[PDB]
Structures are given as structure tokens and as C-alpha cells.
Design an enzyme around this catalytic site. Structure first.
Site: not given
Ligand SMILES: Cc1cc2nc3c(=O)[nH]c(=O)nc-3n(C[C@H](O)[C@H](O)[C@H](O)COP(=O)(O)O)c2cc1C
Ligand SMILES: Cc1cc2nc3c(=O)[nH]c(=O)nc-3n(C[C@H](O)[C@H](O)[C@H](O)COP(=O)(O)O)c2cc1C
Ligand SMILES: Cc1cc2nc3c(=O)[nH]c(=O)nc-3n(C[C@H](O)[C@H](O)[C@H](O)COP(=O)(O)O)c2cc1C
Ligand SMILES: Cc1cc2nc3c(=O)[nH]c(=O)nc-3n(C[C@H](O)[C@H](O)[C@H](O)COP(=O)(O)O)c2cc1C
Lengths: 395, 389, 395, 389
Positions: D155, D183, D251
Site C-alpha cells: 500500500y 482497490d 480483494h
Molecule cells: C484476512 C485477509 C486479509 C487480506 N489482506 C490483504 C491486504 O493487506 N492487501 C491486499 O492487497 N489484499 C489483501 N487480501 C486479499 C487477497 O490478497 C486476495 O485478493 C483474496 O484473499 C482473494 O480471495 P480468496 O480469499 O477468496 O482467495 C486479504 C484477504 C484476506 C482474506
């Protein structure tokens, strides 16, 4: 049909009602109200006509629309104010006309919605109902801001003198528009309500109070007798939006009365999607303001309607539930919940003002996927056993 | 099953049945009937063929149609009267033929249908079933009004002498038309009935042809409706051999499963009749799955001359006899008038296709199977709760 | 994972099993089997690959097809016999290859299906499985009719000598066709089965028994080494139906192995609907016989496939369940249930022979309405309360 | 909440957890995690935005795609290796960034992800989260293999000094690429977390523009992927300013609800990239809702260079630490190989659109509300029963 059990609900009301600050979304007010309201208060507020399909379809049709959000846009500052019917407004939504608020808020009724609408940093337009428990004078003087806008919802009486007096009275008191309701010449049959009376024809659903003979000519006449901008409330087809433009009225609410009148009237969100392009195909877009209501519960819903070209979007039931549980502060909280949801989603959409909300932010390709499944195969599904998750050992 | 248990039933139908005037819609009748009727009365009335998909689809397909109502129209006065088969009628619906009413109403049977159909302000046509518990003469005279109209439904026999007698005999008794059932050359398999008990009939001739209908045209002056058409091509065929009408019907889903909803066949055939000037030559009726005034209205907007209901009248009769039947007629009459007003029209002739949204009529879908695992583990959002206690 | 509880099922088997004459449809056999089979017998028979969507979709896709029945046709006499692979057949359906029948019928296994298929007035073709508990010689001599037809289902071994011997052996014994299975180069992962072993890689789903290297050239070679008509079993796309015609094989089974192999393989009924017109667009229709299987449970299903141009339709699981509950007479009953359902529906369709079953008897306009709903709004649906039926007084 | 009750939990995660080798698919991990994690660990991992429709639609949309598999193809040998961001990779999937692993795995956190990603035969890329419990250096060295590849998710701060430091600092530590999350200018409202507790961050700059990405291109030699694109127009924009890749992502449904499923955006954008010769210029990744080898395959057939998974790895880690993560990798690797064989192809490069049935990709439907009354009274068919007893 209340049971002294009346007291089971008084216990629930007894700030077993959670703190107002703990209310996350509009559905919370709904749930709480459903447990605390009078059986009849809940029947009257929550019911729709016949099988209630239009009532539910109003909401679900929003879900046929997805977003096409812009990324890498400067969305530090977001502005959700706009203009409705010549006034400047803090917010692109409004409180729609609803009858009998004293059923849910016995002490204050509609005066608490005027208060909630105008007390805080964010003011919302209020449409005062003809079927209000309180009088228009009571509701208007309860308004805590000179800046807050109040509209008037009108049923034209069979006795047009009463309506003539009423229109004169409400311009005097300073309402800023007339919403003439045209979708209730006959009263919708709301069967949850009836179940409750019965154990607890046809011309009987007609009333002198709401003139069934109301006609395009009458609106043209009403137009001459008042300087107030007039909006036709309850338009359910594009052809009538065009007629409204033709008689030069100020606006139209695409509405089916919250699914309380004709069942199998369409979701106003899809009437909107069809209507707006046809308006631009004949220069009519900026000459008639188009509002929409029914089934709006989330900021993304408000946003969808705005992107399609609605000037504003109305909510009925959610403000009733908020008022019925927490009075004036409930209303204000509902306003803040919704304002915030709109702000959040605008950032994520990648726009910064109401004017920037446009059709190409939406994915409209499945807007018409309103489906009825073939009935399912009960024998097949009954014998079928689905996959299973691994269990834990249990020691 | 029938286990002396059935005093639990007799207690239900006892003063325990709610006052007739507390009945709001046709489903209320159905519910009450489902708790009070005998297992075998219920199985026989409520049954459909095999998996019962057509049975249910008959109704659900009405829900693929939405309304485009007119507002700001003077709707103080509304008229729902119309013509059917040359005679003037109070309502745009009718009671369809529906065997063995004595299972549900033992003392009176389909005599009580006649009574209900004419004992009050509104007079509704009755189709008399070949499979009726009472005789056609027993029914035709129990009718309290001579204004009320009665039709006859006919299965032609393999022994054509019996059919020639029966036709001449109903002509005599005053039936104003003849409904020839063609969708049951072999009787459909109704599995609810069979499970409780534990396909060619002499009653019904499986060899019935178009030529035989041409034959019956000459041997009678009663107008003939071919009841049980399920494709446009045969509607056209009925026009060509010049009969009066046709019921778009699949026997209430009691015959061929995966026959289409008649409302959907209606929507396909009327535009074709138009493209051929045939829309006047043939009267096109429709039955199956009709439970609401808006169902009836959808049908009429599409071109139907009239719409039939089977089971709802059976259930009202089973519960409250002739009174129930009258009340059912009332419920349905009011539903039509009220919805007419909200639609923004004032006569049956004004119900036209432009009042309808037909854009999703073909959205007859089957979902891909659900993801059992993904759905089980997923936990939905939850509502804010109420404090301590 | 059986519990002595084994005996709870012996009690159920104990002619708590209802009389055979009381079995109405194929689903009855399924239900009964589900209560009486060994946990492992039920796992093996009833399971599909991964999430089992293809397994269920096989059946449901039939429901995207409706009928356009002819009325006022002489349907006194109806004939449901036809020809398959050069033989005359009583019926337009057949028993598909299935492994391990002794799990459900310990005493007789596949010999009871040969008996059920050939004992009665109506005989049905039987496809003998390579994974049969009994030997091909045992199954063939159990056949009670010289007229009953038996086919052979082949897996080509990595060791082609074994397959060469096997093909020679089965033509000697007088089977009338070879079905080469081409949809299982790797073994489908059937998770109900695995759950049961585990508490109760990758090249491990390969086996010398089923050669993963099997190729179009091998079928061309097999064709020279035998005078038996060869059918390719497990074709899942039109392009491979065309290739099959090109190498001049006798037929093809549009099949995904009962949803036991690739998940998200399509329903063979829709592959059929797409394939047949394309065959007629190049003269190929009457030169390749096209069978279909998976999810067939009703005579109307059989009828739908025949109207689209299938030569015959196979059923797997329903015969296993019938055999597992009632042995040879169960199979025969299943045959009679299905024969009758086909006869009934042909009358009501308005046709009198198999040759008369044609595409214009079907409504194919919604064949493609294979949909996935947007997830529903759990909060909205949770607080929503539906209409209600009037209650009864209760005294 | 967290009520001393949570020894019921400690009993669950006790030897009561089934042997790792009994775990069949990724949902098993999810189920087990749902019973053992703290209310707050669960809420934070399992959560989506508002009504969670995008969360679920991410997955369900894969089910709008079916396969057209080739048969009679030699599939004895199959290779699932591929290139991602200039470096060679064992599998066509990766672990996506996913904050606060220490809630579920307290002693080790996202160090155990690194371990699982490289402790066994198959080596899978790891995206390191800005929101990670452990520091980037703590993670990068816990990696048991130097063959294994690591990416960084970033970020950009409102204080651009901090971002310039962090970039230079991760370049140093050996991350082979930089994923810029776009996003989440404002953090999405996750209501499960909030209900348990009873929108602009300095961490994340809401003013981030294209120009700022153009800026970051010059100030670093690490390849930049724009993570969080949700329309085709912005995929095109990323190509024009010449970045390396793009994750089609929303996300995990944690930001804008009613964002489309990335798989559906994928299917729309690849043909457009082709009509522009851009398909090579830009590497297009995809995440969200991926739980099965066939999900991954659908994505690869459409043009995706690689596919990410968030929650499944979090849940495997929460339950069995690094071992769980390795096992999750194994499950997914086998699922891909097995389904590759049944599909009839042998290398990732051979996964192409012609293997897919895309004819119902747009069948994203919302049913008309169900007829509550009609459904209540209706009684379905019933199975034959079993005798007496
Ligand atoms: C608990 C949690 C925390 C996350 N934190 C971030 C983050 O800090 N930055 C980011 O770009 N995506 C973040 N994500 C999203 C992912 O990198 C990813 O886009 C997402 O988990 C894809 O979906 P799925 O969980 O159904 O596989 C996060 C997802 C979860 C579930
Ligand atoms: C309890 C109730 C009473 C209403 N009374 C009126 C009324 O008197 N006049 C009117 O024009 N609309 C009336 N409405 C309808 C609305 O102004 C509005 O169309 C509806 O509430 C929008 O739908 P929603 O409640 O789903 O948001 C009423 C709605 C409800 C629910
Ligand atoms: C119990 C029962 C018996 C019936 N008997 C006949 C009959 O003998 N002849 C006929 O043509 N239709 C018969 N029908 C069907 C109807 O006349 C009508 O087509 C059907 O009931 C329309 O469907 P609905 O019940 O959903 O309104 C019968 C229907 C029922 C429910
Ligand atoms: C228990 C079981 C075992 C099977 N074994 C084989 C086999 O060895 N060879 C083969 O070609 N098909 C085999 N099949 C698949 C079928 O021949 C057939 O494709 C399937 O059963 C059709 O689907 P249905 O059971 O839904 O009717 C098997 C199916 C089942 C259910």
C-alpha cells in the site's frame, strides 16, 4: 391481537434494545422492530400486496446490476450532495411518504422523523404523508432547521374542495413540492393485515378519500392552481413518464408503492434503466426529474439508481423501523448509516460527486435475467446425498 | 391408510374450520382441504403426473410475466363481463371439469358446485365432468338460476354408440357447449395415489383422430371445444377443421410431464393466429395453475377468451360446500376487479398485450447444482442481537 | 466402517423391504438401497467426482427440455423397439457398465443383471464391465435368452497383450460389441469414498490397468484386430464425435462416466443436442450411432434423448440399486417401470414408434438456460416474513 | 466474546483435529478453521464487504463455465509448470497477500506460510502482505529454499517517504516483484468483525493516481503489478503506462460489493487484449473464490498467467501451520494434474479457450421471489417407505 405478551415486548424494548451506536445497517432496525412492534404495527408496515412478489422484487432487481469501478483515481474528497426539485440537498436520498407513524412511535410519530431528518450535520428531505398520524402543521413546526426540506404527499379527494384547501394550506406552511400519488385508486390487498383482523365487496377497496377517477387532465389543472413543483408518484411504465413530460410537470417517482398496490408491477430500478435512455432519445432528460423508490436498503442500491439517471432515491420502511425503535435519533442514525455507505462505495467506484455517477460505471448486461426456475425434482433431490466435510475425531 | 385416526380429521372440519368470511385467497381453501380430506381424496385431487413438474410449472410460468400498468386513468367503474361460446358471462373465468367431488363433499358432490356457481350475485360457467360422482341431470337442475351456463366435458368412448347417446342426451338437458378431452388417450401416472393404494381405458378411446372431430361437428349443433391442446400447430389444426374453441391445457399436469405451461403456449399461439386472421375464428381458453386475479388477467391480456380453474374449486367445495364455491368465486372476482383498476383499464376488451412485460417469458431456467461444500462452510451475515436478558 | 448396525440394515433388508410390486419408480430403488447398503457399497455406487456437479447436472439438463405433444393421433398401439449396433432390441435403453456388483448383491452380482435383462417378456441389452466382480464367462452363461444381447466394456491395458487376449476371449464368448472407455485415463477423485477410508501423489490415480496413453491411432488398430463393432465410450465434445466418424468406428457414447471423472463436463443431453445437427450438416448422421448416458431416471428423459437422435440411452446407478435390493427381479422390475414410462409418454406425445421421435416434438428454446444465481441476500431474506395461510380455530 | 468457553476450542484443535493426511480438499481446512479459531480470527479471515455477494460470486461464477474435454490424447505425462513475472514456477497458482496470520497461527504466523511454500517437492510463490504480523525480513529468511520466489504487496503511504524506504528495503531482501494494491483507497466495511467489536487510513493513500504508478516505474527495477483491477478499461490503462501485470481482483469481496467476479472480467478482457496485441505486454493474474483445480484451470484456459488464493492458505495455516500450507499446495497441485489429464492436455501452454464452454458465462441470474403460499401448501412426491417394523 395483542396478548399481555405486550410485556414480553416491553422487556425487549427495555434497553435490551442494544445501544444505537451498535446498529450497523438498515436491516438491524428491521429485525429489532419485528420483535418489538405491535402485531398490527408490524403487519401494517411490513406487508405488501397479495403474494408480495413486487415488494421483494423491488429489492432483488438491484442485484441484477453489478459495478465497473474505476481504479487509481483521486478519491480523497467525495461529495454526495445534489439538487432535487430546485432545492440543494445534502444527500441523494429522501424519506418517502408513509402513513401512521404513531403505531411505531406513539409519543411523537412523524414529528420524530422531521427531527431526525433535520437535526444533524446531514439533512435529508422528508415527504409528509396524507396518512400521517400527526398534522402537516405539527410536522412542519417540529422541523429543527430552516434549511431542511419538507415535501408534501397528496391524495386527491373525490371532493376536490378538500384537496384545494389542502394544497393552499401546505404551500402556506412552506412545503417545497407536491407528490401526487397515482398508484392507489383502489387499495392494495395486504393479506398479513387482514389475517390479523379476521380471527384476532370490491367497491369496498374504493374510498372517497382517494379519487379513482383521477386523470391526466386533473394534474394539468392542479398545475395551474399552485406554484409548487408537482411530482407524479407511482409511475410504472415509460409511456407515463413521457406523458408526464408532455404535460410539463416537474418530476415523476418510478414507484409501485413499496409493493403494496399492484403485484407483478416491475422493479422501478428496471423501469428506470429502460426509461432514461428513451428520455435522452428525445431531449426530455433535463426537463423531468426522475425519482425512484422501493427495496432500497444499501448505499450501493442508491448508487445504482443514480448512475441510471435518477435525481433521487426514496426509502419508506427502513425509516419507519428506525423511528419505531429509536425515534428521532434512530432516523438520524439511519441517515448516517446510509450516507456513509454511499460515501464508501463512491470512493471504491472511483467517483467523487453525484454528477460523476453515470451508466458506464454499471454492468447492465444481466439486468434482464429475471428468472423462474423449473420446479425442482423433489424425489431426485430427496434421495441425493451431498458431499461432506471431514469431521473431527471426538474423544 | 384411513386409521380411525380420522376423528382428528372430523375434529378439524368441526367448527374448528374458520368462518367462511375469514378466507382471504384460494390457497387458504387448499390448506384447509389438505388437513381435513381423506388421504385418498387428497391424493386424487392434489396429484399430478410422475414428478409433477408440469403441474407446478403451470402456475410458476405466470410469474415470468410482469405488468406495465397505466396510471391516471379513470377506473372508478370497471366491467369484467365477457362473452364465451356465444353466450354472455359475468366473469372471464370458469369452473373446469374435475372428477369425483363426492370424495370431498359426500352429501352433495358436484351439485354443490352448480349451487355455488349461481346462488349469488356472480354467475360462473360450470364444466361438467364425465368423471363426476353425480349424473349430468342431477347437476343441471341443482343449479338455482336459469341464467347460469353449463358446459359438458366428454371423453369419446371406443364404443361410439355410447358417445352418440351421451351427446344427444346432454344437448337435451341444456348444456350450451361440448368440451372434448384429447390429452388423456392413456391416463397419466399419479404416483401419490398409487403409493397410497399399496393404462388404456374403455372409457377413453386412444384412437381419436381429427377426422372423428370432423364427424362430431356434423352430428351436433352444440359448439365443440377441443380441450387439451399443447402446441400451436394443433391450435391451427382446430381452426382449419373449424371447431369453436380450444383449451390450452395439459390436464392440470395430470397427464404428460414436461408439457409446457399453457400460458406460455398461449403467448406463442395468439400472435400466430393474428398472422392468419384466425383470432376471431377460434376461441382460445386456458387452464392450469391459476390461483390469482393477476393470473387470469395475464391470460386475458394475451388473448385468452376465458380461463379455467380445477383444484381451487374442488378444495373450496370440499371444505364449505356450495358456500365455499360461491366464496371462491367472490375472492377471484374481487382480485380481478381490484387488479384491473391498478392496471388502468375498465373492460375485458381493453386487456391487451401492451399491458404486459413479456421480455422474460422465456426465462425458464434450471440452475447448475449447488456447491454443497462451499455452502455448508460459508457463514452468512447475522443481525444485531438484543442485549443480555 | 461398519458397526454391527450391520444388523440394523439386516432388519431393513428383512422383508421390511416392501414387496417388489410396490415399487413405483427408479427413485424407490435408490432410497431403499441408501438405507440397506454397506456404507462402502453406498459410497462407491452413489459418489461422483469432486463436488459432484456434473453428476447432478447430467440429470437436471433433461429439465431444460420440454415437450410439444401431438394431440388427436391414433395411439392405440405403441412400439418401443429399435436397433442398436446391428441387433434388434426390445427397448431403446440399455444397462451401462458398472463395476463391483457383489458389493450390493454378494451372492450373484452381475449374473443377476444378465438374468434380469434377459428373463422376462422385455429384454434389455447389457454392457458387461471390466470392473465386474464376476467373470465375463460367468455373466454370459447366466444369460437366460439366446436373443438377449450382451456388450463388452473395455479398458485398454498398458500391457496390450492382456487387451488382445481379452478382446479375443469376449468375441469367442459371443458379446456383440466393444465399448472402449476413454474418459478415465486418470481415476476420478470420489470424495465420499475417500472420507470413509480416511478415518473408518497424483500419479497414484494412474494405473497400468487403464492406459493413459490411449490414442486415436490405438482405436484404428483395435478396429483391424476385431470384427466386433466398436463404440467409443466417454465422448464429451462434438469435435471428438466427428473424429470418431472419421476413423469409421460404429458409434460413440456421449458420456462423462456418471459424473465420476471430470467435474464440469457438460450434460451429455446438451452435447447431443449440439452434436446431431452438426452430424446432419455433413452426411454423418446414419454412419455413426450415438448413445447417451448419465442422469436418466424417467421415461421422458429417454424420450428426450431419442428425439434428439440418440440411438439408445444407458442407465448405470438405477440398475445397481434395483439389483442391490431385489437381485434379478429388481432388475427386471426396473426394466418394466422404465418400459411402461416410455410407452405412456409416447402415447401422450402422440407418436407410435421410435423412428417417429424427432426434434420437433421438443421445445429446445430454453436448452441453454443453465444458470448460476447471484448469491442471495441473507440479511434481507432473514428478516423478511412471508405470507401465511389461515390457521384453524383450535378449541 | 471470547468466554473461557474457548477450552472447548482448545479441545477441538487438540489431537481432535484429524490427521493431516485425512484432509481431502480446501473446504476441509476451512471447516476445521471455523470451529477452532477465535471469533475475532474467524470474523477477520472469513469476512467480506457489506452483504458479501461479491465474496461468494467470485467463486460461483466459475460454475458458469463448463469444459469441452479432449479424449484419446496421450496424457500419461503432464506438466503444470509455467513462468510468472520473468521467473520459472512449479505450479500455475500462488499464495495471495493476507494480513495478520498470527491470529490463527500465533507462534509462527506468515513464517509458516514461507515454510509450507518451500519445504516440499512443490515450490509456490508467496505474496507478502503489508498487513503481515511478521516483518518482511522475518518471513523471507524462514523460507527453507532459495529456489522459492517471494513477492511483495504494497500500500503506498500518504507520506511517500515511507513507501520509498519500504520499496528500496524489499528490493534489498530479494523480492522478485512488487504488487501495488489499488482497490482499497478506503477500507471495506466487514460487518461480521464489527458486530463482534460491539474509513480513510494513513497507511493507504486515497489519492493514488496512474501518474504515481508511472513514478514508481522509474524509482524501481522490480516489476510492478497493479493488484485490484475490476474493469477491462483499466487493464488497458495498465498496459499503456507499461507495467508488468495486473491482478483482476476485488480483494476477496472485502472492498466493493457488487464488483464482478474476476473470472468474468478475465473472460471479457483477454479477447480485447488480443484485438490489440497487448496479451504479451501484460501479465494478467486473477484471484478470488478459487477452491478447486478446475477453478484454476478455467482461469488459465482464459488467459490468466497465474491464479491467487487467499483464505484457503490462511485456514490451512491456522489449523496445521506450515504442514497444512504444504498439504494445501499438494491438494491443489494434484487437483490440477488430474483434471488436466481428463481435459486432454499436457502443458499449461495448451490450456486455451477452445477447451471451455463459455456459452453460459453471462447466465448470472436473480430469480423472481418465490410464491410462499403456493409452495407451503404444495406437497411434493414421496419415496416408497419400508414395511411396518
Ligand atoms: C484476512 C485477509 C486479509 C487480506 N489482506 C490483504 C491486504 O493487506 N492487501 C491486499 O492487497 N489484499 C489483501 N487480501 C486479499 C487477497 O490478497 C486476495 O485478493 C483474496 O484473499 C482473494 O480471495 P480468496 O480469499 O477468496 O482467495 C486479504 C484477504 C484476506 C482474506
Ligand atoms: C407503511 C406504509 C405506508 C405508506 N403510505 C403511503 C401513503 O400514504 N402515500 C404514498 O404515496 N405512499 C405510501 N407508502 C409508500 C411509499 O411512499 C414508498 O413508495 C415505499 O415505502 C417505498 O418502498 P420501501 O418501503 O421498500 O422503501 C407507504 C409505504 C408503507 C410501507
Ligand atoms: C381431481 C381432478 C380430476 C379431473 N378430471 C378431469 C376429467 O375427467 N376430464 C378433463 O378433461 N379434465 C379433468 N381434470 C382437469 C381439468 O379440467 C383442468 O384441466 C385442471 O384442473 C386445470 O388445472 P388446475 O387444477 O391447476 O386449475 C381434472 C382435474 C383434477 C384436479
Ligand atoms: C458404480 C459405478 C461404476 C462404474 N464403472 C464403470 C466402468 O468400469 N467402466 C465404464 O466404462 N463406466 C463405468 N461406470 C459408468 C457408466 O457405465 C455410466 O457412464 C453411468 O453409470 C451413467 O450414469 P448414471 O449412473 O447416472 O445413469 C460406472 C458407474 C458407476 C456409478
Amino acid at each position: 391481537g395483542e396478548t399481555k405478551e405486550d410485556i414480553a415486548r416491553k422487556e425487549q424494548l427495555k434497553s435490551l434494545l442494544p445501544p444505537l451506536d451498535n446498529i450497523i445497517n438498515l436491516y438491524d432496525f428491521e429485525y429489532l422492530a419485528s420483535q418489538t412492534l405491535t402485531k398490527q404495527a408490524w403487519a401494517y408496515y411490513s406487508s405488501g400486496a397479495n403474494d408480495e412478489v413486487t415488494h421483494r422484487e423491488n429489492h432483488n432487481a438491484y442485484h441484477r446490476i453489478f459495478f465497473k469501478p474505476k481504479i487509481l483515481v483521486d478519491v480523497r474528497k467525495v461529495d454526495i450532495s445534489t439538487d432535487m426539485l430546485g432545492s440543494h440537498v445534502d444527500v441523494p436520498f429522501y424519506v418517502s411518504a408513509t402513513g401512521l407513524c404513531k403505531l411505531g412511535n406513539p409519543l411523537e410519530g412523524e414529528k420524530d422523523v422531521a427531527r431526525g431528518c433535520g437535526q444533524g450535520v446531514t439533512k435529508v428531505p422528508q415527504m409528509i404523508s396524507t396518512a400521517a398520524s400527526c398534522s402537516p402543521e405539527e410536522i412542519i413546526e417540529a422541523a429543527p432547521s430552516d434549511k431542511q426540506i419538507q415535501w408534501y404527499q397528496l391524495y386527491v379527494n373525490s371532493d376536490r374542495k378538500i384537496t384545494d384547501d389542502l394544497v393552499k394550506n401546505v404551500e402556506k406552511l412552506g412545503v417545497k413540492a407536491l407528490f401526487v400519488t397515482v398508484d392507489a385508486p383502489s387499495l392494495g390487498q395486504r393479506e398479513k393485515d387482514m389475517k390479523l383482523k379476521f380471527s384476532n365487496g370490491a367497491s369496498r377497496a374504493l374510498s372517497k378519500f382517494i379519487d379513482p377517477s383521477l386523470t391526466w387532465k386533473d394534474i394539468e389543472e392542479l398545475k395551474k392552481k399552485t406554484k409548487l413543483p408537482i411530482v407524479i408518484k407511482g409511475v410504472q411504465r415509460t409511456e407515463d413518464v413521457i406523458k408526464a413530460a408532455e404535460i410539463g410537470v416537474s418530476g415523476v417517482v418510478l414507484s409501485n408503492h413499496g409493493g403494496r398496490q399492484l403485484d407483478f408491477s416491475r422493479a422501478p430500478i428496471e423501469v428506470l434503466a429502460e426509461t432514461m435512455p428513451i428520455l435522452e432519445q428525445r431531449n426530455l432528460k433535463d426537463k423531468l426529474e426522475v425519482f425512484v423508490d422501493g427495496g432500497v436498503r444499501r448505499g450501493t442500491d442508491v448508487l445504482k439508481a443514480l448512475c441510471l439517471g435518477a435525481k433521487g432515491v426514496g426509502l419508506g420502511r427502513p425509516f419507519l423501523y428506525a423511528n419505531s425503535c429509536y425515534g428521532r435519533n434512530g432516523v438520524e442514525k439511519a441517515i448516517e448509516i446510509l450516507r456513509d455507505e454511499i460515501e464508501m462505495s463512491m470512493r471504491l467506484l472511483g467517483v467523487t460527486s453525484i454528477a460523476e455517477l453515470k451508466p458506464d460505471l454499471l454492468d447492465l448486461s444481466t439486468l434482464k435475467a429475471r428468472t423462474v426456475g423449473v420446479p425442482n425434482d423433489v424425489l431426485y433431490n430427496e434421495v441425493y446425498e451431498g458431499p461432506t466435510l471431514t469431521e473431527f475425531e471426538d474423544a
